[PDB]
Amino acid sequence: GHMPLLSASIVSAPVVTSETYVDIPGLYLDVAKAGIRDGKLQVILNVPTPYATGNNFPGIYFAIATNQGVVADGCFTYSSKVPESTGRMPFTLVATIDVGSGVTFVKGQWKSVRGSAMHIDSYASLSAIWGTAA
Amino acid sequence: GHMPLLSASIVSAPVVTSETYVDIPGLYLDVAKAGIRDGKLQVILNVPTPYATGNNFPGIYFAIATNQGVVADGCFTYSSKVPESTGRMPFTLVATIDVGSGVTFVKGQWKSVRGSAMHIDSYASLSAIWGTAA
Amino acid sequence: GHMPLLSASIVSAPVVTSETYVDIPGLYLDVAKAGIRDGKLQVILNVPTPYATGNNFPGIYFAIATNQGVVADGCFTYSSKVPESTGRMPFTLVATIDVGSGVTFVKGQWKSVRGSAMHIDSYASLSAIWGTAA
Numbered sequence A, B, C: 001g002h003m004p005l006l007s008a009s010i011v012s013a014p015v016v017t018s019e020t021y022v023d024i025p026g027l028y029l030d031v032a033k034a035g036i037r038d039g040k041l042q043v044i045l046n047v048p049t050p051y052a053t054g055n056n057f058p059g060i061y062f063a064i065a066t067n068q069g070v071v072a073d074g075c076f077t078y079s080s081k082v083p084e085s086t087g088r089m090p091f092t093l094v095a096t097i098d099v100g101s102g103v104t105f106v107k108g109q110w111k112s113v114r115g116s117a118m119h120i121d122s123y124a125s126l127s128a129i130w131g132t133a134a
């Protein structure tokens, strides 16, 4: 384990609405367990096939979070107030975290855009590659 | 070659329809040749500018596949049955594979959503970073 | 610094139009400074929440560029000539570069699709992982 790669994957999540970032169940990396105590992690949240349902330009915010909270966030939104059929909108988020700050874990989170119901019904991943500062 | 990075890129592919996952020609990493026999690979399939044509909510499924078959898959779809003009829908898929299972290669694949013709006419990549278990 | 991870992030950029690739201010990795003189870099440009405004199927081209120019590029475009409201269209681009060619830096760049104004008003990143040839 000189060069550890962390990964977690899901294929579904209970459909929820949330005004605040809530964990995506199963997208969680236990960093402490891996013996990562310092250095840097490049974390990728990959949700390649999500959709959102709602009545007001639906979408989903996603975030990468540690113990210390959200490090990076982003969203997709549809370009129609009520899309003919809510299409799949691939989403990727990349963030680099300093593990020494007190990071024990990394997780993926999501939140509604304008009261959207959030849908994962296929593969989604959270991955991390360990490195050093330059 | 202590820390090998694998990469393959294309700029086009013959436009095809397929009911089943078929290789995207040229998105192929010969892992065995690189002397990767165990450990983990973080594989990224990046198709940043695809489009699909069809008459029924067109889209494309994409997959990361090894010798042992599809490890991860996802899709984009338009939100209109027949879009005014089929726009570019960036797509990224990330998967982590155990090389020891008998992985000699990693490839990108695609399949039609609802009989869509699949279009790559610009840069697309398949990349991999080698690591260990934690 | 045996295994260096490079990263840069922004949360906004002045809104501009450009017929040619122009730097996205702040998405810049000083590679030379990190003492990377050879080997390979896997570079990810992550713009998870952009939008474009215009009157003719708006969109944005993005590129990864070194001192030696653009190594990889891609775009998103809307599927309507004038979208009801220009939605957020997550964009990721992945490229692997040979550092020995005279690479001192890596940057993210963008260009208008059909005279689109280019909008970043939230987190965007440029990341790189160092490896060797196989």
Ligand SMILES: CC(=O)N[C@H]1[C@H](O[C@@H]2[C@@H](O)[C@H](O)O[C@H](CO)[C@@H]2O)O[C@H](CO)[C@@H](O[C@@H]2O[C@H](CO)[C@H](O)[C@H](O)[C@H]2O[C@@H]2O[C@@H](C)[C@@H](O)[C@@H](O)[C@@H]2O)[C@@H]1O[C@@H]1O[C@@H](C)[C@@H](O)[C@@H](O)[C@@H]1O
Pocket (backbone or CB within 6 Å): A051, A084, A085, A086, A087, A088, B056, B057, B059, B077, B078, B081, B113
């Ligand atoms: C209630 C309903 O029928 N929804 C369908 C959807 O119906 C379309 C209408 O809403 C539209 O305005 O009129 C057209 C006329 O053609 C449609 O009848 O059709 C989509 C497919 O276009 C369908 O979703 C597919 O469902 C199948 C199983 O039947 C698959 O699981 C397939 O992957 C689904 O398509 C994807 O998911 C949807 C949300 C979009 O993102 C597509 O672009 C993807 O390809 C709708 O079906 C519903 O949603 C499904 C996920 C499922 O939960 C069904 O139980 C539900 O009816």
Ligand SMILES: CC(=O)N[C@H]1[C@H](O[C@@H]2[C@@H](O)[C@H](O)O[C@H](CO)[C@@H]2O)O[C@H](CO)[C@@H](O[C@@H]2O[C@H](CO)[C@H](O)[C@H](O)[C@H]2O[C@@H]2O[C@@H](C)[C@@H](O)[C@@H](O)[C@@H]2O)[C@@H]1O[C@@H]1O[C@@H](C)[C@@H](O)[C@@H](O)[C@@H]1O
Pocket (backbone or CB within 6 Å): B051, B084, B085, B086, B087, B088, C056, C057, C059, C077, C078, C081, C113
């Ligand atoms: C048959 C045709 O003319 N298709 C065009 C498309 O026409 C539009 C109509 O379908 C629409 O409903 O009405 C409007 C009125 O303005 C249009 O006339 O226009 C697009 C550009 O908007 C055009 O695609 C561009 O073609 C050029 C070369 O002319 C470039 O290669 C450019 O990158 C193309 O745009 C992209 O690709 C298309 C598919 C979309 O994803 C855009 O959002 C991208 O920016 C259509 O042209 C066709 O498709 C091209 C790929 C090419 O194969 C042409 O030979 C073909 O006419």
Ligand SMILES: CC(=O)N[C@H]1[C@H](O[C@@H]2[C@@H](O)[C@H](O)O[C@H](CO)[C@@H]2O)O[C@H](CO)[C@@H](O[C@@H]2O[C@H](CO)[C@H](O)[C@H](O)[C@H]2O[C@@H]2O[C@@H](C)[C@@H](O)[C@@H](O)[C@@H]2O)[C@@H]1O[C@@H]1O[C@@H](C)[C@@H](O)[C@@H](O)[C@@H]1O
Pocket (backbone or CB within 6 Å): A056, A057, A059, A077, A078, A081, A113, C051, C084, C085, C086, C087, C088
């Ligand atoms: C001028 C204007 O009002 N633009 C709004 C937009 O208005 C819609 C109309 O253009 C449409 O055709 O009719 C509907 C009727 O409901 C709307 O009134 O609404 C969007 C939200 O739907 C709004 O953008 C949001 O603005 C807030 C602050 O008020 C937030 O910053 C929010 O994140 C914005 O939404 C996102 O950004 C826009 C561009 C889209 O990508 C959405 O899908 C995202 O969720 C428009 O507001 C404008 O753009 C904002 C970025 C901001 O600069 C405002 O000052 C400007 O009015």
